């Protein structure tokens, strides 16, 4: 069996907790219930007929993910870096993830950033062209989600799979 491991990152608002919530355990919750503890949850998948063991990670802050990330997060196949689409100051901070994200790991990790909350269309405040080329341009590939009405989710995660295979 294949054995992933999978960390989360972006901002507050941005949908980390709610994106493996709602993977793991089919269960959203329009409260922001802030994460102030490293947490993991867990997916069994098939691909090619091998089951695939997925731990996913949940952050608790780029100041601790930092320190505990040479530690403890050294052995991570992929990243999902988060960001909300009505939110500019939250997918222009994810540069600063993908950077600080590799001047800590190589390059050997699967890197996706999401668009998450897409949803709320209408309030849509950052460019897919422009998100699209910054993802290319780090070897991240880019997804759209929404946790809430449970979009891209499972379509996200299968492909992360794909590709650390
Ligand atoms: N409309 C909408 N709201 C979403 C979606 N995903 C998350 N949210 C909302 O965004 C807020 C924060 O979600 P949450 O998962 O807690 O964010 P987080 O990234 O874990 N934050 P933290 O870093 O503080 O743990 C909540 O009000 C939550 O319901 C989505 O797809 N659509
Ligand atoms: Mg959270």
Request: include cysteine; aromatic fraction near 12%; glycine fraction near 4%.
């Given at each position: 069996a294949y054995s992933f491991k999978v960390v989360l990152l972006g901002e507050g608002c941005v949908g980390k907790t709610s994106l493996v919530?709602?993977?793991?355990?089919?269960?959203?919750?329009?409260?922001?219930?802030?994460?102030?503890?490293?947490?993991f949850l867990?997916?069994?998948?098939?691909?090619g007929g091998k089951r695939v063991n997925l731990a996913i990670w949940d952050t608790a802050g780029?100041?601790?993910?930092?320190?505990?990330?040479?530690?403890?997060?050294?052995?991570?196949?992929?990243?999902?870096?988060?960001?909300?689409?009505?939110?500019?100051?939250?997918?222009?901070?994810?540069?600063?993830?993908?950077?600080?994200?590799?001047?800590?790991?190589?390059?050997?990790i699967c890197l996706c950033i999401v668009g998450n909350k897409i949803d709320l269309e209408k309030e849509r405040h950052v460019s897919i062209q422009e998100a699209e080329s910054y993802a290319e341009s780090v070897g991240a590939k880019h997804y759209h989600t929404s946790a809430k009405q449970n979009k891209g989710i499972e379509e996200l995660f299968l492909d992360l799979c794909k590709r650390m295979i």
């Open positions: 919530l709602r993977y793991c355990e089919n269960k959203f919750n329009d409260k922001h219930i802030t994460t102030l503890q490293a947490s867990t997916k069994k998948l098939n691909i780029q100041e601790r993910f930092h320190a505990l990330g040479p530690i403890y997060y050294r052995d991570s196949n992929g990243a999902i870096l988060v960001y909300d689409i009505t939110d500019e100051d939250s997918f222009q901070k994810v540069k600063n993830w993908v950077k600080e994200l590799r001047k800590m790991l190589g390059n050997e």
